[PDB]
Amino acid sequence: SVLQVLHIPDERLRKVAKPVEEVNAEIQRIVDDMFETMYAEEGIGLAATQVDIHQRIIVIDVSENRDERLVLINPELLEKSGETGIEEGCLSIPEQRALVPRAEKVKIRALDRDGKPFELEADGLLAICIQHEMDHLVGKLFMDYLSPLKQQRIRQKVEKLDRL
Ligand SMILES: CCCCC[C@H](CC(=O)NO)C(=O)N[C@H](C(=O)N1CCC[C@H]1CO)C(C)C
Ligand SMILES: [Zn+2]
């Protein structure tokens, strides 16, 4: 099913997620709804928190053809290096984009859809995406990186939409 993405200033987006106990059939069902919502909203990644599900689950799919799924359950950052930044938009901040400073390279460890642990070295867009989803699980949004004035402008611009 398609799940409802929370938008600022919904306080639930600021909720820190607890680890997934064991990857079971219910966890795997949450992974599907998440992917389904991700593809529906034309997003390249998604974290459970945006859907009001407070567990450490993240789905990412960067393929043009939508057939290269990446599941990150209980992800942990092992190492990071460099700086970079692209204009990022967030489904929770409806239709806004901004350049956000991010580490250029990251090495993580996580459990896949079957609960099997795996390590991953990411660079480029994958590295930035992982960082942005992981931020979600800890109640953090890309605009938190911005100045008070920009955060203010983002908040006021979002506040003109959501209706329509
Ligand atoms: C790379 C930054 C985070 C990617 C994940 C988000 C979706 C999201 O809210 N995840 O929490 C997304 O699809 N963002 C898109 C996005 O920012 N993209 C699409 C690919 C390129 C990059 C824009 O510069 C927009 C268009 C919806
Ligand atoms: Zn987001």
From Swiss-Prot:
| CC terms in the record's Gene Ontology section | cytosol
- The first-level EC class reads hydrolase
Q: Which SUPFAM superfamilies match?
A: Peptide deformylase
Signal peptide boundaries? none
What influences the activity of this protein, per its activity regulation comment?
Inhibited by 1,10-phenanthroline.
Annotated GO biological process: co-translational protein modification; translation
| Amino acids binding Fe cation | C90, H132, H136
EC number in record = 3.5.1.88
Q: Which residues form the active site?
A: E133
Q: Does the keyword Iron apply?
A: yes
Molecular function terms, GO-annotated:
ferrous iron binding; hydrolase activity; peptide deformylase activity; ribosome binding; zinc ion binding
Enumerate the catalysed reactions. Answer: N-terminal N-formyl-L-methionyl-[peptide] + H2O = N-terminal L-methionyl-[peptide] + formate
Q: Which cofactor does it need?
A: Fe(2+); Zn(2+)
Give start-end ranges for the coiled-coil region(s). Answer: none
List the keywords (alphabetical): Hydrolase, Iron, Metal-binding, Protein biosynthesis, Zinc
Task: Return the Pfam families for the record.
Answer: Pep_deformylase (PF01327)
Q: Describe cofactor binding as the record notes it.
A: Upon overproduction is isolated with 1 Fe(2+) ion per monomer, a Ni(2+)-bound form is as active while a Zn(2+)-bound form is inactive.
Annotated family: Belongs to the polypeptide deformylase family.
What's its job?
Removes the formyl group from the N-terminal Met of newly synthesized proteins. Requires at least a dipeptide for an efficient rate of reaction. N-terminal L-methionine is a prerequisite for activity but the enzyme has broad specificity at other positions.
User: Whom does it interact with, and what assembly results?
Assistant: Monomer.
From the Swiss-Prot or TrEMBL record, give the protein name.
Peptide deformylase
Which gene is this protein's source?
Answer: def
